[PDB]
């Protein structure tokens, strides 16, 4: 899709193998934010939004928090506290055609700067600065969209760069998306490191005597300590009390 009305997929309820991406040499920029590139396969994510657009080559630096520019303000704005990773690679031989390519267009004039993650399909003509324009482009009201016109003879800064941005928040369970890991058997009554669906901690696990409501993925005691969790494999409720410690 073009940079206006960028395609968004809501990736959820699957195991995500990130190892095929961050070790793949096909990508030009793999600048992640708020997460290490090599730790992506070892984490569980609440919801993963995958965006996709094609932009001009010199404009790939604008897709980053806090930047400014036409793409950054009128087409696609990342928030100031963005977490995720931005993936881009050159696509001059797939997105550009001989004599030109015109399926890719970008918004050039807008009355106001976009909110983060906003999407503006509105092709209504630009503000006049004068008497308003009924429906006709000209002299005050311009067409807000504009095609790059990608050509194979253009420089690397003008070549069509195909960009994918993965936006995803990393709270605890219920994590719909997590990386690949061999789930193993349950070890009760021992001081055991656990990774329950993204909920990570160290403690002993006891068969719980408390009754969860059928929606609660885990529980907490007073002062926000995670006292209980339900098993993602067999739906048993397990109490987590800390491993025994004390001064000697």
């Amino acid at each position: 899709a073009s940079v206006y009305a960028w395609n968004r997929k809501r990736i959820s309820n699957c195991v995500a193998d990130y190892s095929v991406l961050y070790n793949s040499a096909s990508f030009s920029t793999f600048k992640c934010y708020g997460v290490s590139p090599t730790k992506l396969n070892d984490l569980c994510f609440t919801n993963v939004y995958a965006d996709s657009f094609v932009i001009r080559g010199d404009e790939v630096r604008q897709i980053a928090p806090g930047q400014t520019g036409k793409i950054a303000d009128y087409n696609y704005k990342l928030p100031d506290d963005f977490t995720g990773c931005v993936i881009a690679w050159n696509s001059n031989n797939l997105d550009s055609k001989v004599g030109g390519n015109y399926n890719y267009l970008y918004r050039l004039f807008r009355k106001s700067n976009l909110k983060p993650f906003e999407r503006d399909i509105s092709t209504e003509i630009y503000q006049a600065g004068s008497t308003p324009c009924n429906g006709v482009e000209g002299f005050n009201c311009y067409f807000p969209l504009q095609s790059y016109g990608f050509q194979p003879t253009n420089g690397v800064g003008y070549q069509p760069y195909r960009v994918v941005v993965l936006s995803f928040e990393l709270l605890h369970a219920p994590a719909t998306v997590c990386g690949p890991k061999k789930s193993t058997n349950l070890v009760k009554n021992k001081c055991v490191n656990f990774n329950f669906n993204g909920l990570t901690g160290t403690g002993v696990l006891t068969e719980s005597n408390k009754k969860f409501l059928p929606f609660q993925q885990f529980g907490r005691d007073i002062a926000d300590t995670t006292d209980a969790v339900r098993d993602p494999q067999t739906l048993e409720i397990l109490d987590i009390t800390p491993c025994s410690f004390g001064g000697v």
Partner: antibody
Amino acid sequence: QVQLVQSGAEVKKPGASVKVSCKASGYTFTGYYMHWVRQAPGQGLEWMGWINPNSGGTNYTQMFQGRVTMTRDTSISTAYMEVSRLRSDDTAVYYCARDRSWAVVYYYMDVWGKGTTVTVSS
Amino acid sequence: ALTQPPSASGSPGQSVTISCTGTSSDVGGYNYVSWYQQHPGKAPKLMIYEVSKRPSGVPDRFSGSKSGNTASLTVSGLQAEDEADYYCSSYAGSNNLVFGGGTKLTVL
């Protein structure tokens, strides 16, 4: 090289139709608007209308609205101007022109084609 | 249409002018006055795109500026290169653009 290649000349019967084509080259076809202006062989120069290759929005002058239409062809990087009834007042050389401005519809005509001559017969 | 004087005269190395009698009610209000230099038999080119601004490649010896309702383009130190028709144009208030009649530069 930003010269626009206009089509060849044509001769048409009175009252009949005719279409003229100007092919872009060098510059980015989408963007820069394309205005159509006519010059009678005796005198003067008159403006008909423009189509933008960016969006295909058209405007026309009042003297030609409802009797002459325009269209674009981004596949061949060319824009067409169509005349429905070749009246004997319209036997003239028709010129296509770019605009200086990037993507706004102003009127700053820089580079002009060689011009396809049109003739009304008898 | 635009009223316009038909001709101007001179000799190579002199200074002469050509004027454009537009109406201040409709023509001069939205200014944007563009002048074009047209030899016979060939396409013209813009010679002052705004009311006073030359395009790239235009010699500096050509000058112009609106003055009240009328607009004028002047040629200083001309030669055989400047024997051409000259046309006035403007916005005319809405998308219906208008041109002038077209004065003719002449050198004795």
